[PDB]
Symmetry: C3
Subunit: 283 residues, 3 copies
Amino acid sequence: MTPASYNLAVRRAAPAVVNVYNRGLNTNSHNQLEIRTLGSGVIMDQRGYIITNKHVINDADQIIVALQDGRVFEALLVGSDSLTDLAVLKINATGGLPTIPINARRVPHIGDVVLAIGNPYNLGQTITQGIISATGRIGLNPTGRQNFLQTDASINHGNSGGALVNSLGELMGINTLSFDEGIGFAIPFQLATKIMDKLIRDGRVIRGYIGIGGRGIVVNEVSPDGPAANAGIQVNDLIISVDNKPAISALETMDQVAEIRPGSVIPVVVQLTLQVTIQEYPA
Amino acid sequence: MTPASYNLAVRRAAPAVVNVYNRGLNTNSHNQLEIRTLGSGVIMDQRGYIITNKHVINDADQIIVALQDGRVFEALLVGSDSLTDLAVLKINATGGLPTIPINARRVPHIGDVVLAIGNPYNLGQTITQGIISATGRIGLNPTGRQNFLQTDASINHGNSGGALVNSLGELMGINTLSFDEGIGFAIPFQLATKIMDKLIRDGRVIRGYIGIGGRGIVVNEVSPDGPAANAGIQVNDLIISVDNKPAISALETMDQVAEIRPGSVIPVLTLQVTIQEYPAT
Amino acid sequence: MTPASYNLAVRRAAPAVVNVYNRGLNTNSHNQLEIRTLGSGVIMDQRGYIITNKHVINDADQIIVALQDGRVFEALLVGSDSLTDLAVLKINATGGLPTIPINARRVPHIGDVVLAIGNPYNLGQTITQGIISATGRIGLNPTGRQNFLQTDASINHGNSGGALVNSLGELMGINTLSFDPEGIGFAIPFQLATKIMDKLIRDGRVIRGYIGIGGRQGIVVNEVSPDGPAANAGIQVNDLIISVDNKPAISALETMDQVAEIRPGSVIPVVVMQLTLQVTIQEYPATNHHHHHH
């Protein structure tokens, strides 16, 4: 017979999970480059773009990336995002690079078997398995850990920034050491992809803000003094059209707003059409 | 090729797992119902019965149940049992209720893949995967967590009182934290079912108690003047037969004793013994 | 539609996993064999040899083994090995024994599903599942936890000395509590455990060949310990080894594992760069200092 195994997922995806090293110049008294932090990362494509955790590369003076095939490269930071604890690096790829399998049409399901791939510097590349416990949201509106992907695969320091893949080796998400026990989190791959593209284009993730709450949609708390204030909007009414389409849920409405570029003026129903200019999510 | 997955089990079972909120008036003073303890529960049937843990509902003064589909209900406490940390609730079943898949003929086996489904109101409904490490006894004589079903599927607070199902979505047990590292406990579903019915029938679990720790069956203790001392029972003699059936093993006889109602007199020479309700905990 | 299950692996392998009890005569204040330390062990074959952990049987005044089917036996300590934390026990059972399924041709793969079977006397036989996170090395040459097999199957006190098996019930390794580790367990790869057990059965201890080199179409000497088989012969520091005992000297690790396998006292030819040199291999420097870093 054939022993049950997830080796196919490993062979397919593991070569694209790298070791990421944050090194500093003022870490020791002799001003010699020294490791301050370690982590994992995922090569996204052949141009040399790698996704890792922001907390892994914070304040580094030199970022080194090491691959399983032995190659070592210095990486450049292209940008980071505190809300997702994601950062994007850029290595100068010569001779081709291994890249993570991705299936943009695949829809992750609660209960899908998942493998967490991390290259802890304390024990070599490691793999652990669990399942997807909650799928998380892929929109740009920040809502906290409860909306990241959750899994019971062991996620720890030698995993963080590494990959979460299904049994086919396809990228399900980017492992991230906690947020907000026995449960780990990851940024859904669909959001991790959107964030990387935004970080390459602009050097930061620009989100659309409107300062409103609720749960038609009832404006529960909308007095952040943001845009919703400097326009037609009371602290106790019900909005209808987010812009030109129904405002079912608050969550599924803050995502539309997040994608709206700052400076844009849109029509917020409530039926006195009061226009508002979207701002850039607070620092 | 399709990704390996236990989503089938999830689709079938998760809608039947609910959040349970234990509110309390004499929570801090305004004398207003403040949420004191959260938990999970399993909707068992269309009559609206729900199984959760006894620790979740202790001192509630008001219990609320929220289903994954959004509906919220006030719940009636129909009974609870300390020995198994189970409690039964009942809610309005009018509009139809999602129910947990259950197969009474399904024999659980060590090695079976199981999913632990808990509805914590902090990170939402969470599903974890493991296997059954030990099947546990389904008898009524209380013994201890050791005889409960054991699994390595993460069992925590946002799980406690929730469901443990197999890959078909069928109920294997009810997750319980602890009350007779890496391993969690659950009440086997066959015991949970028997406990729930006894609670519906009498409002409490009534257990037979003879008081003969037979560690044939070699007796070993009958000191608390138990209904054994008050009959033809020594202190270190064996037991060839009880209630008229064989006396093969001790744990299968104690579950048997706990199954006969208190008062009744049966043959245990032969000084017809009288079973008396288990000692109130 | 039958539920997903690893019960088959359980039925084949769990019977071979036993409880091991280590007692001592001066445990209490009455001078009676008092259960000190517990553990698990695995019956490797019908003759009655059993593998368990060294730390479980250390300082044992009497070792007893209890099988799942009830049978209970007193056991003989045939030997142990600190480096791998393994020990071998022997029990005389004339009525047939349940043995662990073993397939010497199976090659373990990273991602293979595994079950950790531990027979503790606190919760009964325990079974947990995970996968192989890293396969580990199988040579005799000392290495430390980093090269044992790694798994996310949970490895604790009630597992140690127990079995790690694949979904067919075949032995992948022997569970061992850490070495050299958060939610990661270690096991001695079965190929290594089998070699160790054979050596313990024959010699009562593991005898490893030593050549005295730390050299990382040839090998580059890094160090040449004082008074070692290499030190006391043609070898100083930057010498290029072409082959040892007339065998292509490709890798340092392969060559070191090859030396560990050579009986001490043997005299072998070591080609360097042309320059043939006769070296008499010694026993591996006796020292329980290997996993300390000190």
